[PDB]
Amino acid sequence: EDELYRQSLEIISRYLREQATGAKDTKPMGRSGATSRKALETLRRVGDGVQRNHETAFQGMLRKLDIKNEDDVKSLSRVMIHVFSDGVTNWGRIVTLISFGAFVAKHLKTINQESCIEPLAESITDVLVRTKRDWLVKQRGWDGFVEFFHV
Ligand SMILES: O=C1NS(=O)(=O)CCOCCCCCCN2C[C@@]3(CCc4cc(Cl)ccc43)COc3ccc1cc32
């Protein structure tokens, strides 16, 4: 159906939840599981680092957003399109999009709003896929993501 969106949601959703809970989801990945697994391995590697390399900027943006409830979470999509979409696309910016997402996911857990995590993963996936599909396809999607960061 829309395999790119589905795979993206599973990858982004799993990373955010893992980041928030600190525990790995042992369920099998859906279609294209080998790729999604590698993708998650990759996000654990480069995503974690981004959150630390931009510690100050990340906490600065989080404060600016002042996320306290569900309505604040809903407001995030507008900011994502404003900051992420409106700019030249590259894997780094995509990793930052997803990494700050994980940063926000951990925050949501600290303020006991864990139920907003999956909805947030959906919003991020919507922004990534629905505004950058052409770039993603041209760059070989997630297979391209894994190859890009291959060590
Ligand atoms: O390359 C970037 N900026 S840059 O050019 O200045 C590169 C350096 O920046 C350092 C951190 C700067 C602060 C982080 C701002 N964000 C987080 C966003 C906005 C709110 C939001 C909410 C949620 Cl749930 C997910 C994502 C996001 C959008 O994803 C991004 C993607 C790329 C950059 C910055 C962001």
UniProtKB/Swiss-Prot annotation:
Keywords: Apoptosis, Cytoplasm, Developmental protein, Differentiation, Isopeptide bond, Membrane, Mitochondrion, Nucleus, Phosphoprotein, Transmembrane, Transmembrane helix, Ubl conjugation. There is a cross-link at residues 24, 27 (Glycyl lysine isopeptide (Lys-Gly) (interchain with G-Cter in ubiquitin)). Interacts with HIF3A (via C-terminus domain). Interacts with BAD, BOK, BIK and BMF. Interacts with PMAIP1. Interacts with BBC3. Isoform 1 interacts with BAX, BAK1 and TPT1. Heterodimer of isoform 1 and isoform 2. Homodimers of isoform 1 or isoform 2 are not detected. Isoform 2 does not interact with pro-apoptotic BCL2-related proteins. Interacts with RTL10/BOP. Interacts with BCL2L11; may sequester BCL2L11 to prevent its pro-apoptotic activity. Interacts with GIMAP5 and HSPA8/HSC70; the interaction between HSPA8 and MCL1 is impaired in the absence of GIMAP5. One of its GO terms (molecular function) is protein transmembrane transporter activity. It comes from the Eukaryota. Belongs to the Bcl-2 family. This is Induced myeloid leukemia cell differentiation protein Mcl-1. Induction: Expression increases early during phorbol ester-induced differentiation along the monocyte/macrophage pathway in myeloid leukemia cell line ML-1. Rapidly up-regulated by CSF2 in ML-1 cells. Up-regulated by heat shock-induced differentiation. Expression increases early during retinoic acid-induced differentiation. It is found in: Membrane; Cytoplasm; Mitochondrion; Nucleus, Nucleoplasm. It comes from Homo sapiens (Human). The keyword Aminoacyl-tRNA synthetase does not apply. Cleaved by CASP3 during apoptosis. Treatment with taxol or okadaic acid induces phosphorylation on additional sites. A motif (BH2) lies at residues 134-149. GO terms for biological process: cell fate determination; cellular homeostasis; DNA damage response; extrinsic apoptotic signaling pathway in absence of ligand; intrinsic apoptotic signaling pathway in response to DNA damage; mitochondrial fusion; negative regulation of anoikis; negative regulation of apoptotic process. A motif (BH3) lies at residues 39-53. The keyword Cytoplasm applies. One of its GO terms (cellular component) is Bcl-2 family protein complex.
